[PDB]
Amino acid sequence: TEACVTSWLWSEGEGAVFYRVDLHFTNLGTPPLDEDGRWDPALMYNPCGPEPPAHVVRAYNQPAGDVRGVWGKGERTYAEQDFRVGGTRWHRLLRMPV
Amino acid sequence: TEACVTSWLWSEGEGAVFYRVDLHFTNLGTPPLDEDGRWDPALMYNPCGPEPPAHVVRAYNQPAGDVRGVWGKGERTYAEQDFRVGGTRWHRLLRMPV
Incomplete structure (x- = not known):
């Protein structure tokens, strides 16, 4: 069951x-688990691909914390994070709920 | 349909x-503010839907340190986070290539 953002x-x-x-976002319900009750999805399931360039992926998946701006209006509002990754400055707009 | 992690x-x-x-991931060319300075209409255009539930989205973007790095079908490296938000304990895996 699907959702997207x-x-x-x-x-x-x-x-x-x-x-x-x-x-x-795909809800997998209740997948099969091991003893204890742990899920190990990185090893159980095939990833999608082909992959985007390496540095783009590292930048998107970077932690960055400092919300430095708010973009857009009303119900479609975005939080901007502003950060460097090895001398390159990145901006990332994330949808922020209510 | 283009690039994926x-x-x-x-x-x-x-x-x-x-x-x-x-x-x-969809490569949109140049950063959206040109030297003129006109904006790329692609920016914040036509966001996908419907959106996942708010606690799920929040959980996905919660700041949290990496607990460990894992593989990863095909020896693909992922960063793991183990954190709590809203009384709930969450586990998260993010593609992190070098």
């Missing part, structure tokens, strides 16, 4: 990039 | 839920 992300400087990210 | 997110306790998240 969209992010945006872009870097600065020479060779700057700009991506849309559609996060497709 | 996978994440995993799950909770413990009664009402535990389990989710696969596929992150679809």
